[PDB]
Design a protein around this ligand. Sequence first.
Ligand SMILES: [Mg+2]
Ligand SMILES: [Mg+2]
Ligand SMILES: [Mg+2]
Ligand SMILES: [Mg+2]
Ligand SMILES: [Mg+2]
Ligand SMILES: [Mg+2]
Ligand SMILES: [Mg+2]
Ligand SMILES: [Mg+2]
Ligand SMILES: [Mg+2]
Ligand SMILES: [Mg+2]
Ligand SMILES: [Mg+2]
Ligand SMILES: [Mg+2]
Ligand SMILES: [Mg+2]
Ligand SMILES: [Mg+2]
Ligand SMILES: [Mg+2]
Ligand SMILES: [Mg+2]
Ligand SMILES: [Mg+2]
Ligand SMILES: [Mg+2]
Ligand SMILES: [Mg+2]
Ligand SMILES: [Mg+2]
Ligand SMILES: [Mg+2]
Ligand SMILES: [Mg+2]
Lengths: 62, 62, 119, 106
Amino acid sequence: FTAEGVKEIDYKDLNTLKAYVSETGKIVPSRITGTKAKYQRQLATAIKRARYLALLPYTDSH
Amino acid sequence: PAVKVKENEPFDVALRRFKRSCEKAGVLAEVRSREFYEKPTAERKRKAAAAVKRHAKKVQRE
Amino acid sequence: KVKKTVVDGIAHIHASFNNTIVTITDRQGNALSWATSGGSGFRGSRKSTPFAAQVAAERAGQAALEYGLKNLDVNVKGPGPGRESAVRALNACGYKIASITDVTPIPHNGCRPPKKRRV
Amino acid sequence: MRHYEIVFLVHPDQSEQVGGMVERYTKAIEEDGGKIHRLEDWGRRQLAYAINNVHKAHYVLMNVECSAKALAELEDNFRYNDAVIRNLVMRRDEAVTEQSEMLKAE
RNA sequence: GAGUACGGUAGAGGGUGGUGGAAUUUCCUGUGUAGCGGUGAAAUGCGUAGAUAUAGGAAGGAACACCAGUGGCGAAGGCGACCACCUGGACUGAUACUGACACUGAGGUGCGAAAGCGUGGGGAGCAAACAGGAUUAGAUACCCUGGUAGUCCACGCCGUAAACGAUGUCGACUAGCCGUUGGGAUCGAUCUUAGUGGCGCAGCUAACGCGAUAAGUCGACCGCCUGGGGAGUACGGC
Ligand SMILES: [Mg+2]
Ligand SMILES: [Mg+2]
Ligand SMILES: [Mg+2]
Ligand SMILES: [Mg+2]
Ligand SMILES: [Mg+2]
Ligand SMILES: [Mg+2]
Ligand SMILES: [Mg+2]
Ligand SMILES: [Mg+2]
Ligand SMILES: [Mg+2]
Ligand SMILES: [Mg+2]
Ligand SMILES: [Mg+2]
Ligand SMILES: [Mg+2]
Ligand SMILES: [Mg+2]
Ligand SMILES: [Mg+2]
Ligand SMILES: [Mg+2]
Ligand SMILES: [Mg+2]
Ligand SMILES: [Mg+2]
Ligand SMILES: [Mg+2]
Ligand SMILES: [Mg+2]
Ligand SMILES: [Mg+2]
Ligand SMILES: [Mg+2]
Ligand SMILES: [Mg+2]
């Protein structure tokens, strides 16, 4: 996220966000995607924030 | 934890794929976690022991 | 005396560490037939085995064959044994399974569970 | 004033007065002295879960400059309307003007 | 040395409001019929007055899965849903400014987990006391079925914990190696800064062990100890 684009991960860009959520709907741990801790925290807050607006589901089932 | 039977595969592939998805989702672990109340002292102790074992194993690899 | 016909039903398996409950319904959630492990004649430590779940699933399927029901979706819920013997017995009854789902309820924070047993 | 970013989705059956509601909202902060920097209408989408037993909504995204009075009155307008359904106010430290996703799909 | 002015970062630091989703329990209704629940095995208990199961609707309270990590912030106690508002400190870079303005601290003042107490709200889950069922020689227990104060909120008191790193605060020096958190530079690599972990040379220790986050070598100030019980008890004071 530091090379060229996304200075701060945005809740609106669903394409980036969907790459970091599993098929169940949970947030993938940083030890799997290799993401840095600071950017992982930004992903967590972005995913929750988009989840509130119903852009992304809380759970696959609902 | 939800599969479909698609294009007439036998009912042994579907069952094993369902089992694999259930294992990946960590369903039974979640159910066993909340069977009883684990007081925060015990939870902190478990986390500390897990961290100690994780670091020792990671160090031993080299 | 009265009868009915229905196809493309939904089978709910409710597993637990003590007993399993099988219930075939239509897609609207209206029960047609049901069977358990305690009703199949095990009644104790034998009630908590995948064999009892298999027997219960076959009994419930044979009870529900009256309506037809050539198609079934499956909803499994519970941690107990028989989580899979019922599913493999249901097709052995002679059904065709469209899909299988797991609908176990997981609290996010929820209420607090009981104390830990000191055995 | 202060910069603010607002995501505001509307009940699908009311998705015909949404534009008029938009300029009505803009007016009050205009005569208050506020500003508009970005306005975007990317509504008529599919909800990820049922909200008040509906599955579609009309999304609007607005970046504004406002003071406490203007924000409070706009937020009350959100409170007591019946097409408001859901809301989010997410103050930013700067101003942005150039799109979020629009309709990237061809 | 100690502080001030100026850009910028990271954060479960604090306070006041509002709003989410998952799940439990109760109530109403439809389908449907004889079991459910529990255990090492049982039984009490719940069901043909229609339970358990399944579907639709409603109310209400509390705790915030995944992210989550020998991670972060705070003087300590401690702080995990999201958003707005009010607010404290820390880290980081350059230039300028004041000119010893510092350290410690008996009394004293303030913050201080949980349980507890007073007044007024609230009541889902759990659960001291309590009741029943088992086990047992007995069982005022462990286990099972229920269940009240309490757990939640506002204001006030209490001022105690294995309140622990069982290690008072401040400052200066002493080989190295491997991680990780928040920043800087130079050309993924090197250097450096404030935290957080695992090893380890000297040195220290009764030993275990510590080892730049010393229990090493030195300074400044404070608290405390003098065999085990009686006893952190008796009497007096607050
Ligand atoms: Mg129990
Ligand atoms: Mg029911
Ligand atoms: Mg319901
Ligand atoms: Mg004092
Ligand atoms: Mg208390
Ligand atoms: Mg009390
Ligand atoms: Mg009392
Ligand atoms: Mg009281
Ligand atoms: Mg009271
Ligand atoms: Mg009870
Ligand atoms: Mg009270
Ligand atoms: Mg003491
Ligand atoms: Mg002590
Ligand atoms: Mg010291
Ligand atoms: Mg010190
Ligand atoms: Mg010291
Ligand atoms: Mg020192
Ligand atoms: Mg060492
Ligand atoms: Mg010593
Ligand atoms: Mg003596
Ligand atoms: Mg005394
Ligand atoms: Mg006295």
